[PDB]
């Protein structure tokens, strides 16, 4: 008979219980030991709270000193939504190349939906500490208090760490830059354009160190979408109320083309909408001959059900190279981080009572 | 318990005791069609079988049924549920038996890998004294607020 104490499925490694200390995570010069961190987090290992807070606050301090609008030269690999899919982030760095020798730009939405959001934050923040001028992180619409308390990131923090760690993330997220000007050619944002943003200088003038407001240019940068019928407009209005999001706007193809021409840009690179292929190239601007808009989405098999590919964009040697990748296995969690007792006890009480009723007739 | 209840349980015991041996075997329980598809029948029988001889005698039958009385308190109900998981009856839910009992309930709705992963995480998160197993106290810390004891009531 199977042992009642030893584990049944021995091929599954038992996760480590030990929490890594500061000496184990930071080397002699105070640099993060990202190889140690990567291996531990892939095993669902945790850090000591003080060490998690040090990563979060040290990463925040770097972000805090960056501009609203980053100036990033090519080459760079541009990445879209991650949504807590840590084991797909590991594959993403395999496909895009090691941060030790690859410049990176992430367009936000690191957390929620996937159940490894805090591991994504801790690893990306450690990489930002280690590579402060070659790895870049923008804010997405989920990097805020409003969405992380509605979705699961806050609960995830309280299960694995503490609300103090959640609160530290929220203050760090307030430091995230909002946009990137890439190779003097591309405006890179999570969501898109705004009726109140006509020039790049309009981005530079924003106050970003705050929870995103319910309306306005900072909101729109994080939240806006192209029209459903982008490029095929009967819709003559440049900006219309975004009924899918419940806030911000849809932007039209003429709206994007006008912005690009006025600001001497080639294209807008953004994320924020899942794509079956991991990317979408939108209608070319009649004045550039280049797609006016590009969506990049880096979360494969989104929500474990979409069955989509992910992609990143490696821009190098005047080539825009789309690199797709499939999803990777990850450890299982019951919905809402429910434990097996809470999950099963209702059924136990139901079925034992049912038996007794039938036994007694 | 109540006299008229004892009389009714005697008559029901005899009807279930197909071979009139004075004890109820697993086959005899499984003769009831609605028990054949209940995945926790063998667990309940094992709990009733306090002397471990594989069958339920009348004393075991009465004491087992008594735990589902309206007068039983929360601890009594929750301790029966605890014993569903505690296959080896040592007073602690260990990893192997937690997996096995959950596997009985879920069948093919989860793969063995997925089930072992969430079993591991529940053991780690619910173990508070570090011995690697779940005591009744640790068990009640997790589920005590769910009020499942209110549902584990049977009218004899």
């Amino acid at each position: 008979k199977l042992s009642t104490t030893d584990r049944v499925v021995k091929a599954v490694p038992f996760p480590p219980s030990h929490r890594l200390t500061a000496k184990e995570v930071f080397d002699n010069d105070g640099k993060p030991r990202v190889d140690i961190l990567k291996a531990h987090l892939m095993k669902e290992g945790r850090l000591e709270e003080s060490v998690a807070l040090r990563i979060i606050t040290e990463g925040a301090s770097i972000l805090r000193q960056e501009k609203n609008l980053l100036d990033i030269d090519a080459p760079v690999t541009v990445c879209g939504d991650i949504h807590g899919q840590f084991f797909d982030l590991m594959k993403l760095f395999e496909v895009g190349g090691s941060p030790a020798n690859t410049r990176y730009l992430f367009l936000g939405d690191y957390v929620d939906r996937g159940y490894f959001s805090i591991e994504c934050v801790l690893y990306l923040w450690a990489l930002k500490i280690l590579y402060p001028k070659t790895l870049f992180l923008l804010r997405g619409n989920h990097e805020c208090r409003h969405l992380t308390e509605y979705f699961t990131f806050k609960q995830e923090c309280k299960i694995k760490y503490s609300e103090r760690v959640y609160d530290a993330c929220m203050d760090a997220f307030d430091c995230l830059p909002l946009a990137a000007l890439m190779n003097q050619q591309f405006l890179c944002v999570h969501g898109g354009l705004s009726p109140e943003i006509n020039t790049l200088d309009d981005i530079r003038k924003l106050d970003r160190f705050k929870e995103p407001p319910a309306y306005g240019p900072m909101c729109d940068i994080l939240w806006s979408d192209p029209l459903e019928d982008f490029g095929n407009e009967k819709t003559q209005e440049h900006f219309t109320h975004n009924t899918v999001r419940g806030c911000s706007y849809f932007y039209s193809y003429p709206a994007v083309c006008e912005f690009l021409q006025h600001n001497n840009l080639l294209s807008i690179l953004r994320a924020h909408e899942a794509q079956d292929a991991g990317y979408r190239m939108y209608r070319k601007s009649q004045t550039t001959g280049f797609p006016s808009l590009i969506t990049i989405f880096s979360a494969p098999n989104y929500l474990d059900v979409y069955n989509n590919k992910a992609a990143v964009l490696k821009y190098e040697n005047n080539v825009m190279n789309i690199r797709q990748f499939n999803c990777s296995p990850h450890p299982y969690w019951l919905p809402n981080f429910m434990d097996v007792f809470t999950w099963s006890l209702p059924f136990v009480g139901e079925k034992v009572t049912e038996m007794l009723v039938n036994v007694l007739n | 318990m109540d006299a008229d209840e004892i009389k009714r349980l005697g008559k029901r015991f005899k009807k279930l005791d197909l071979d009139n041996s004075g004890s109820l075997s697993v086959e005899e329980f499984m003769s009831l069609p609605e028990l054949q598809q209940n995945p926790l029948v063998q667990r309940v029988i094992d709990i009733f079988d306090t002397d471990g001889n594989g069958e339920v005698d009348f004393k075991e039958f009465i004491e087992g049924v008594s735990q589902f009385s309206v007068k039983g308190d929360k601890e009594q109900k929750l301790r029966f549920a605890f014993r569903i998981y505690d296959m080896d009856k040592d007073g602690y839910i260990s990893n192997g038996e937690l997996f096995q009992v959950l596997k009985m309930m879920v069948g093919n709705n989860l793969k063995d890998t997925q089930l072992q992963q969430i079993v591991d995480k529940t053991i780690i998160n619910a173990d508070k004294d570090g011995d690697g197993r779940i005591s009744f106290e640790e068990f009640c810390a997790v589920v005590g607020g769910l009020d499942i004891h209110k549902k584990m009531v049977v009218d004899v």
Partner: peptide, 19 residues
């Protein structure tokens, strides 16, 4: 229910498909 269930000049564009 017989079993427990889980609750509810110009750059060229190139493609490297998934491995």
């Amino acid at each position: 229910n017989n079993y427990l269930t889980v609750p509810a000049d110009l750059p060229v564009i190139t493609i490297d498909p998934a491995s």
